[PDB]
Design a protein around this ligand. Structure first.
Ligand SMILES: CCCCCCCCCCCCCCCCCC(=O)OC[C@H](COP(=O)(O)OC[C@H](N)C(=O)O)OC(=O)CCCCCCCCCCCCCCCCC
Ligand SMILES: *[C@@H]1O[C@H](CO)[C@@H](O)[C@H](O)[C@H]1NC(C)=O
Ligand SMILES: *[C@@H]1O[C@H](CO)[C@@H](O)[C@H](O)[C@H]1NC(C)=O
Ligand code: ALF
Ligand SMILES: [Mg+2]
Lengths: 815, 324
């Protein structure tokens, strides 16, 4: 429905041959990124608490809330800005290329991004096409052309297109004779094999020749020309409308399953923090309703707190209780998940098993933000030529078995024709001998409503009444277009549901003759059904860039075609067999190391703040911190920061030499098990149970009038220093009971973080500096340690606290 | 091409412990057989500690100190007869307890100037702004600034043992040695200038509630101001609304006589500190100590309770695996 005049010569609203793969402009990158970041609930909360500390009231300091929040922004904007600037650098090498155009009876040469619809482009042998042309002629006669569409269907065989009959004579011989023609075409579509048009070649005086146009004349974009010196086309779709640019779908953003849990745990601890602050504020003003409960002649408000508006202090006290309990949502969990991801991703690059002497290269990590998603995969969408076959690859059949033993569903999405596309799968051990092929190819649905019968003859009477090993589906790009695209006609029994069910009940699926975008429409149907299966797509071609961008984690093979899929993927292995070790060993380890760092970071801070919330019932709900400002500050930085960072970087939950030998161990962590509601309520009650033994275990210890053989009383900085010594030793030993792989770095950080809390407590306490306005912790840790009844109360409370963890071990280890 | 280093290949040598029921259940017995003996040890010790508390707040007309709840001509005195059943033999420690007194309130805990009390001349003359509204009085800086100081406990309690006749004989109570050695010799210092103390506090003023400046707390030159043990002891906040502060030291006699023989006694108190305004209570605690301090049953009963709950769960699951 678009009218193109061949030479731009008369017998508008078209794009201009400019592909735009980037997302940010290099001028508006900060306003658009700082909005995509601070629009999250985690990054937006950290900024609202930092503004209260700077404005209303802070227990320790505002520098320890804005410094980690600034590192976590600046570091995510460099990743997101570089990973995007690399797309500008790629859009330029495709634009700003040389393309010779026949403008006015001569051979002009513009760049690819300056072509316009309806102008005779000229392509030499082995030159990619600058747009979707319409072959007008060839230097030699016969009006033929040999194209290889290795970037559209991934194959590498010599296709053949035919020039328009009336124009095959125009070969640099008056091709610019104001050649009268009008190519009436259809709107751009992604079909990649359908094209209906019409041309109106005109004669010296007047003509009416109208030759039908079909997909045999359209020279698509990104298809190298072969065995042909030169041709002559007519740009019909130029930029963002070429059938190669319609099958892109772009990259939206990839979040792990662990980062979607961190966000659920942060919205649970966001209501635990608003209840702690709203319960303490309601009680604070029920307690102050007694005249002698506020200003009892021994501490009196000066004059400014007696005059402050009644309702202005209720809201300011609420903010003082949130700035006090704010530690239960740790800013250091995000500072540590960044270091852990960036540092932990170096074990894939370094691995010597991901090394190919052929290409003389190894693995490659393009995004360290999905390490923990390699261990949660449920579906594996492959590619046939290049990934599975080169005949099959080294261990393309032994890797597909280890992927079924682990509980994954391997589908093969290809662009080759189902003749040879099917033979391979019979050698990859993916289609067994006694497996009945349920085929929906075009050689089975030669009708209009016939397949609606097939989808039932295969589902409601053939496969879902039962045997999980017998049926295997086969589909076609021609048929999948009727199921996927034409699924908005009937709603009582939708094709996309009747067909989606047949796939989950089939052993393996194989889609032949897929366009680059259909690989991304299948990978998106799976992402939607019945929960949220985690999909992984692996391919070695440029036509795989649309499913590599659509899946949850996309692996790009480094092969013969090029590095087009290796740079759009998240990881890159130079082989298919390297996928077994990549997600069975590396994926299992990466998930358990980050799912425990997330569970332990939330638990480790509820044990810390729960004693400080209970303490309010024993002050006048006055927001008096239980611990010293030097302990509040160093808890997550020094005393408890290192042990869990070395656990996240070197901890074989299972020996990796055993993780690759037993793929069945992959199912133990399959549904985000370690971060479910079961394991979450265990950690949240351990922390609420321990935090109550810490405070109330020492509350009763302080009912004696003295804990020394000299009869000297302890203050409130020793009450909180005893609750803090029981807390650092409990949360540090809880992680020593969880550790199963003790390297010399785990001894150093676990026993060194404990020996440092003691050495620091003797250092910080024991000198009058002076650079502080207070000397409250001068000798508190030294006196606290001169009493035997305090050594015992601490040894007993870091045993009552670690009892539910030592008892649960003997239960999980017998019957 | 790839660095084949132990660290880089994730193949460092590790220990990899395997803890199991058959390995942990003997730990449930090592705990039971170590926590029950300790628990009985420190539970019997806490029972050999003699103690007595004499609540002398008044608030009930049947009390002697009801004349001191709202006096008229008041320097106020009491006399609370009490009797000791069993003698006190070792060292004795006289305390004073306050209840419903929030020494841990946030606006209170901070109302001090740690640099002023540390003998700083710069801070002695311009105290901090945390110690407010007790920072200046009649346009002069208060010598010890703050609310923590202003409300120092200022009752005078003296015990009297009534001999065989009615003649009362006094008990010797020593004021020195009741505050942390570190926060009297280091953390609490006097102004540096000179040897006479009244002139080190020149541009300062006594707290509002005081009756004598901070250089008149004692006559002893080593217990005179900013290093007074009574002062230093009140400055160490309480950590709970019901607390005890060490008051005196009744020391064991050279002979093996009883430190505080049994019989009838007299608690003569000068009722200065008012505590009924906020429904508080004042009491006096006379106690002896042990290797574990005062008398507190929690720690003993908590080692038994945990040494028996652990020695049972050990037996419980030890036989449950003897089912074979
Ligand atoms: C191309 C892509 C580039 C990508 C690059 C990424 C690579 C990252 C490299 C690593 C750089 C690390 C920079 C750290 C900057 C952190 C800022 C910082 O320190 O602020 C302090 C934060 C504070 O946390 P919080 O206490 O929970 O929050 C306080 C609470 N919200 C509040 O109210 O205020 O505290 C924390 O955020 C804790 C942070 C973790 C600390 C871990 C390091 C330990 C430091 C050394 C401590 C010595 C301890 C010695 C122990 C002895 C052991 C032998
Ligand atoms: C101590 O106790 C009695 C009680 O009435 C009192 O009369 C006596 O004067 C007091 N002794 C001194 C020295 O104040
Ligand atoms: C004792 O302290 C109270 C309250 O601080 C005060 O009213 C009284 O004047 C003081 N009496 C003295 C210092 O003798
Ligand atoms: F061989 Al293909 F997509 F089918 F690379
Ligand atoms: Mg390919």
């Amino acid at each position: 429905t678009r009218t193109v005049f061949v030479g731009n010569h008369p017998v508008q609203r078209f794009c201009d041959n400019r592909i735009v793969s980037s997302k940010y402009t290099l001028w508006n990158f900060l306003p658009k990124n700082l909005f995509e970041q601070f629009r999250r609930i985690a990054n937006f909360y950290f900024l609202i608490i930092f503004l209260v500390q700077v404005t209303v009231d802070t227990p320790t300091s505002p520098v320890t809330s804005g410094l980690p929040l600034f590192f976590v922004i600046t570091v995510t904007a460099i990743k997101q800005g570089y990973e995007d600037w690399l797309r500008h650098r790629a859009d330029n090498e495709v634009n700003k290329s040389t393309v010779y155009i026949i403008e006015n009876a001569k051979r002009v040469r513009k760049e690819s991004e300056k072509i316009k619809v309806g102008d005779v482009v000229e392509v030499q042998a082995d030159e990619t096409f600058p747009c979707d042309l319409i072959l007008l002629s060839s230097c030699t006669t016969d009006g033929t052309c040999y194209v290889t569409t290795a970037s559209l269907d991934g194959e590498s065989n010599c296709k053949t297109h035919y020039a328009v009959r009336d124009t095959i004579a125009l070969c640099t011989a008056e091709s610019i004779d104001t050649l009268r023609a009008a190519i009436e075409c259809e709107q751009p579509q992604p079909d990649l094999y359908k094209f209906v048009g019409r041309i109106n070649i005109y004669s010296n005086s007047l003509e009416a020749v109208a030759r039908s146009l079909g997909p045999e004349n359209l020279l698509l974009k990104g298809a190298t020309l072969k065995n042909t010196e030169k041709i002559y086309g007519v740009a019909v779709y130029t930029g963002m409308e070429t059938k190669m640019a319609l099958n892109y779908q772009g990259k939206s953003q990839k979040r792990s399953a662990v980062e979607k849990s961190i966000n659920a745990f942060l919205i649970v601890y966001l209501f635990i923090l608003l209840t702690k602050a709203a319960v303490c504020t309601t009680l604070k003003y029920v307690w102050q309703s007694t005249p002698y409960n506020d200003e009892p002649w021994y501490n009196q408000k000066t004059q400014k707190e007696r005059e402050t508006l009644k309702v202005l202090k209720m809201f300011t006290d609420f903010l003082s209780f949130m700035v006090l309990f704010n530690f239960i949502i740790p800013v250091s969990m995000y500072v540590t998940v960044e270091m852990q991801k960036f540092l932990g991703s170096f074990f894939i690059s370094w691995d010597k098993d991901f090394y190919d002497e052929e290409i003389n290269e190894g693995a490659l990590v393009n995004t360290s933000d999905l390490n923990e998603e390699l261990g949660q995969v449920d579906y594996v969408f492959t590619d046939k030529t290049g990934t599975l076959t080169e005949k099959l690859q080294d261990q393309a059949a032994e890797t597909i078995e280890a992927l079924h033993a682990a509980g994954l569903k391997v589908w093969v999405l290809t662009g080759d024709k189902m003749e040879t596309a099917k033979s391979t799968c019979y050698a990859c051990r993916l289609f067994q001998t006694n497996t009945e092929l349920l085929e929906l190819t075009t050689k089975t649905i030669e009708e209009s409503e016939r397949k609606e019968d097939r989808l039932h003859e295969l589902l409601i009477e053939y496969r879902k009444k039962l045997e999980h090993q017998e049926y295997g589906l086969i589909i076609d790009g021609s048929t999948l277009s009727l199921i996927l695209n034409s699924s908005q006609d009937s709603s009582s029994n939708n094709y996309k549901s009747i067909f989606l069910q047949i796939c989950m009940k089939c052993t393996a699926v194989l889609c032949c003759r897929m366009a680059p975008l259909q690989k991304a429409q299948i990978v998106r149907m799976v992402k939607n059904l019945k929960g949220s299966p985690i999909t992984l797509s692996i391919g070695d071609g440029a036509n795989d860039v649309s499913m590599i961008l659509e899946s949850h984690v996309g692996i790009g093979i480094k092969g013969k075609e090029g590095r087009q899929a290796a740079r759009n993927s998240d990881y890159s292995v130079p082989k298919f067999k390297h996928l077994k070790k990549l997600l069975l060993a590396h994926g299992h380890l990466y998930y358990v190391r980050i799912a425990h760092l997330v569970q332990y970071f939330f638990y480790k801070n509820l044990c810390f703040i729960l004693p400080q919330f209970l303490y309010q019932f024993f002050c006048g709900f006055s927001q008096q911190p239980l611990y010293d400002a030097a302990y509040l500050t160093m808890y997550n930085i020094c005393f408890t920061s290192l042990p869990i960072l070395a656990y996240s970087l070197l901890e074989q939950h299972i020996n990796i030499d055993t993780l690759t030998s037993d793929p069945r161990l992959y199912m133990k962590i399959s549904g985000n098990a370690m971060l479910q509601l079961g394991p979450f309520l265990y950690w949240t009650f351990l922390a609420a149970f321990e935090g109550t033994v810490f405070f109330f275990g020492t509350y009763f210890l302080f009912q004696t009038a003295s804990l020394e053989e000299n009869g000297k009383v302890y203050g409130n900085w020793t009450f909180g220093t005893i609750v803090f010594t029981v807390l650092v030793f409990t949360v540090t030993l809880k992680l020593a009971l969880d550790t199963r792989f003790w390297t010399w770095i785990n001894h150093f950080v676990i026993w060194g973080s404990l020996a440092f809390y003691v050495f620091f407590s003797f250092f910080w306490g024991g000198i009058i500096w002076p650079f502080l306005k207070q000397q409250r912790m001068y000798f508190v840790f030294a006196q606290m340690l001169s009493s035997v009844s305090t050594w015992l109360a601490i040894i007993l409370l870091i045993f009552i606290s670690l009892f539910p963890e030592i008892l649960l071990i003997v239960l999980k280890n017998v019957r | 091409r790839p660095d084949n280093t132990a660290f880089k290949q994730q193949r460092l040598p590790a220990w990899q412990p395997i803890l199991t029921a058959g390995t942990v259940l003997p730990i449930f017995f090592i705990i039971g057989l170590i926590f029950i003996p300790i628990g009985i040890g420190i539970f019997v010790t806490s029972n050999n500690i003699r103690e007595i508390e004499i609540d002398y707040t008044g608030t009930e007309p049947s009390s002697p100190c009801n004349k001191c709840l709202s006096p008229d001509v008041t320097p106020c005195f009491c006399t609370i007869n009490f009797t000791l059943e069993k003698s006190f033999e070792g060292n004795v420690f006289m305390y004073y307890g306050l209840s419903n007194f929030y020494q841990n309130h946030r606006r209170y805990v901070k109302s001090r100037d740690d640099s002023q009390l540390n003998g700083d001349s710069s801070a002695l003359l311009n105290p901090s702004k945390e110690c407010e509204p007790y920072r200046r009085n009649e346009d002069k800086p208060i010598a010890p600034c703050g609310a923590i100081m202003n409300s120092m406990f200022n009752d005078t309690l003296e015990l009297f043992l009534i001999g065989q006749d009615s003649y009362p004989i006094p008990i010797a109570l020593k004021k020195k040695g009741i505050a942390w050695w570190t926060d009297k010799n280091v953390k609490f210092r006097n102004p540096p200038g000179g040897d006479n103390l009244e002139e080190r506090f020149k541009g300062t003023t006594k707290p509002v509630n005081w009756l004598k400046p901070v250089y008149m707390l004692d006559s002893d030159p080593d217990n005179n101001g900013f290093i007074n043990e009574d002062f230093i002891v009140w400055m160490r906040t309480a950590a709970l609304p019901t607390f005890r502060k060490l008051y005196r030291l009744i020391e064991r006699k050279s002979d093996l006589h009883p430190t505080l023989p049994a019989g009838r006694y007299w608690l003569n108190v000068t009722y200065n500190y008012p505590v009924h305004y906020f429904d508080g209570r004042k009491r006096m605690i006379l106690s002896t100590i042990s290797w574990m301090g005062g008398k507190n049953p929690f720690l003993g009963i908590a080692y038994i309770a945990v040494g028996s709950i652990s020695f049972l769960l050990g037996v419980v699951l030890l036989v449950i695996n003897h089912k074979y």
